[PDB]
Amino acid sequence: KIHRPRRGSLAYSPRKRAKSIVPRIRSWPKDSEVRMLGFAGYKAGMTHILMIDDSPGLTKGKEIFVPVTIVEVPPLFVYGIRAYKQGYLGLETATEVWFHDLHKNVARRIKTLPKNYNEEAFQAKLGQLEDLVNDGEIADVRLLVHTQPWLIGLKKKPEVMEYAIGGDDVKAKFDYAKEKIGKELRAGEVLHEGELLDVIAVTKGKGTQGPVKRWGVKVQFHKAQRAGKGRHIGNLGPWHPARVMWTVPQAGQMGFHHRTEFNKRLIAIGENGKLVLDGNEIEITPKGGFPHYGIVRSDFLMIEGTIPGSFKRIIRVRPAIRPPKKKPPVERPQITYVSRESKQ
Amino acid sequence: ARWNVCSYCGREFEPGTGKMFVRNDGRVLFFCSSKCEKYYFMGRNPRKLKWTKAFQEARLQR
Amino acid sequence: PIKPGEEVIFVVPINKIKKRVPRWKRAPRAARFVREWIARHAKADEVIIGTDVNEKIWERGAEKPPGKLRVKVVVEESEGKRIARVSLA
RNA sequence: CCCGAAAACAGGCGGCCACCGAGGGCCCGGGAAGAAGACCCGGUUGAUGGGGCGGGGAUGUAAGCGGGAAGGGAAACCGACCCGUUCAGUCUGCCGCUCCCAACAGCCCGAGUGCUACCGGG
RNA sequence: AGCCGAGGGAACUCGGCAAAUUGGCCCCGUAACUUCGGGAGAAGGGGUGCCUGCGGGUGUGUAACCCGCAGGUCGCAGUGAC
RNA sequence: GGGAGUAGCAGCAUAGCCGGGUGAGAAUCCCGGCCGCCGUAGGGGCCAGGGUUCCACGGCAAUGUUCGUCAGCCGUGGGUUA
Ligand SMILES: [Zn+2]
């Protein structure tokens, strides 16, 4: 008998097409600072830098090559506040409050907007929600946010999302939300340079693939390659049980999956397309523009490593639900070189 | 964060790129591209190629 | 649309159909592409291709038609529906 | 961490319409998506595709013209190759600007009920 | 049914199955054994393009077909494909 | 009857496009041009065998692996001189 591990993981099944291109966040981290727990942007491209190492471990204090991804982040708009209560099993929405003046383009996602809904009505609804929250029934408060893709001329149909707030007092959360609603919100007010983040997006699509590539199955002997079975698995199982088991590798959809990554470091936050290294203001956009993505012009995040998704895809970010015990400092590192040469 | 100089085309290439070749006699060489590496090893003459600096060298040597 | 009379120069991209078909079918597909493209961009109900255009498309055999054609078009309006005629430029 | 309102207690919230018509689909220009279906972006409240003009890139310095060339030939001339014009010429399944051409014109689904016990309020 | 693959080079397999390597011509050089006829194209090594000229053979021939020499020059590669 | 409007109509010679015509009707029939294949055979001549398949006109119910206005198919008339 020969032993070896099975081919592929069963933890990401069923391997099907994602429900939506806009990714959903299932869990939130416990933070003591009262702030919005995430942001959203669009992926632009990749480059590399040379920085002085900070994190614990060998290589500390030396100049190292580091791959980098760039995410364009125009400001979000806060258009609503939601209240949650506790039902029999879990949380259930108690009520919603919206802002009265919304951009003309929001109707491309939300086809049915209210007709008149003036400011005094909005304020009365805010007051009702305030008094409701001021009793003790309510358990959680969340913000309702929409992207503004028209500033960077990428498209006009926004993405609409819900974001949680940190802390442990509903009243503090509500004060924050009431001071935020109806306005534009920037990434520098939410994120801190040097943090660890979790990124969420839908992966690149690859269509239907066979088991060699979908599961890491082996290619058969060359006699079978000449017989007509090279890229096939041997058998679907034994005589008894007299059925095919769900654990047997098979062909199907590959790519376009919901996936989450852990502990990617935020290096720097840029403004208006520039980064400030040593007093200078340099452009991240390489000579000729990013391939399949043009010029960065509003604001951008520099994230260490790689992240799921194609280029113009929507990315969501949250802070470190599962960080290690020896975190690196929350401070922008010392950067000696940023590459902005042609990338095609 | 120093820029290196290629031993075939003579141009500067950026940190984080290229190749260093070592001969068993300690002699070192720097390449910016597989193009230049391959041309060096096959034996194309850069003094004849109008996109190198050895070409201006030879143009003076005329 | 374009006024009948006026001769209009049009650049037809034939590179857009290369790799849609196998190599030995590239020119007979390029002919149909030219026809449909000119019909669309001149809002015509009928297109008449010249022997000169056909011979330019088949010059290098059935595997290597040119990536871009420069063609003069002249439209004649008759019985309503417009009729386009294609020549070389 | 992944799947998950067909979870038969077949859920909650906000908003729109009904009690001609909200909304949706065919159609058109296209991909980041794709075996058919499905998904995403745009359709003159416009840079979606093409063209033109500019950036970046791949090869490696075009044709023509002129001057040399081992040597041969009375002489004129022949002559593989070299030099100059020349980071040239060709191409670009990448980026930006510009309405010059085409995103027109249409066509199809589509919710409306009553009895009993009422509930909570007239 | 076909083309290419970094580093390693039979670790694959009953078994180098299949694929790959060599390859035309001229010169040099050529073992054991042997029925002295062979082995033998043994093995192994060097060269080959284009241009400018100079010579030889038969021939009456500035007709035709063959055999050598020197020099200049280009390419990663000159039986460059077959 | 179900199998099913599914398999097969690929592999050994991957071949059609533009203009004009006929006709109720043309991817498939005719003319011209461009593009291609065979080229010590897919070209030319002619035994055996077959027996009218030869020629012209007129047709398209069936046959031809699809269509067909075409045809070694159907019909009417002809045709082999020592
Ligand atoms: Zn170089």
Could you tell me if A161 and A40 are in contact, meaning their C-beta atoms sit under 8 angstroms apart? yes
* Residue in B with minimal Cα distance to A341: B14
Query: In what helix (H) or strand (E) does residue A129 lie, and over which residues does it extend?
Result: helix A119-133
Residues contacting C15, CB < 8 A, separation 6+:
C67, C68
Token pair, residue C77, equals: 């309006």
Expressed in Å, this structure's resolution amounts to: 2.7
Token pair, residue A57, equals: 């471990």
Alpha-helix runs per DSSP H in chain C: 26-42, 51-58
Is the CB of C62 within 7 Å of strand F? Answer: yes
Token pair, residue A72, equals: 């364009």
Contacts of B14 in chain A (CB under 8 A): 337, 339, 341
d(CA C36, CA A82): 54
d(CA B24, CA B26): 5
Could you tell me if C46 and C86 are in contact, meaning their C-beta atoms sit under 8 angstroms apart? no
Could you tell me if A186 and A299 are in contact, meaning their C-beta atoms sit under 8 angstroms apart? yes
C7 CA, F55 C1': separation in Å?
55
d(CA A174, CA A76): 19
Could you tell me if A185 and A165 are in contact, meaning their C-beta atoms sit under 8 angstroms apart? no
Query: In what helix (H) or strand (E) does residue A171 lie, and over which residues does it extend?
Result: helix A170-180
Question: What experiment produced this structure?
Answer: cryo-EM
Distances in Å between the Cα of A341 and the Cα atoms of A52, A68, B6 are: 21, 14, 17
Kindly state whether A280 is in contact with chain B, defined as any CB-CB distance less than 8 angstroms.
no
Cα B45 to ligand 1 centre (Å): 12
Q: B9 a known binding residue?
A: yes
**HEC secondary structure over A222-252:** HHHHHHCCCCCCCCCCCCCCCCCCCCCCCCE
- Residue A282 C-beta-side C-alpha neighbours within 13 Å: 15
Q: Which residues of B touch A (CB under 8 A)?
A: 1, 14-16
d(CA A330, CA A324): 14
Q: How many Cβ atoms sit within 10 Å of the Cβ of residue A226?
A: 9
Kindly state whether A339 is in contact with chain B, defined as any CB-CB distance less than 8 angstroms.
yes
d(CA A157, CA A150): 8
DSSP C62: T
At A266, phi and psi to the nearest 5?
A: -85, 120
Could you tell me if A300 and A273 are in contact, meaning their C-beta atoms sit under 8 angstroms apart? yes
Token pair, residue B21, equals: 């070749």
Could you tell me if A34 and A325 are in contact, meaning their C-beta atoms sit under 8 angstroms apart? no
d(CA C68, CA C58): 13
- Nearest nucleotide to C50, CA against C1' atoms: F18
> CB pairs below 8 Å between A and B: how many?
14
d(CA C88, CA C56): 9
3-state secondary structure of B29: strand
Distances in Å between the Cα of A276 and the Cα atoms of A283, A328, C46 are: 9, 22, 61
A124 CA, F6 C1': separation in Å?
68
A114 CA, F63 C1': separation in Å?
74
Q: B4 a known binding residue?
A: no
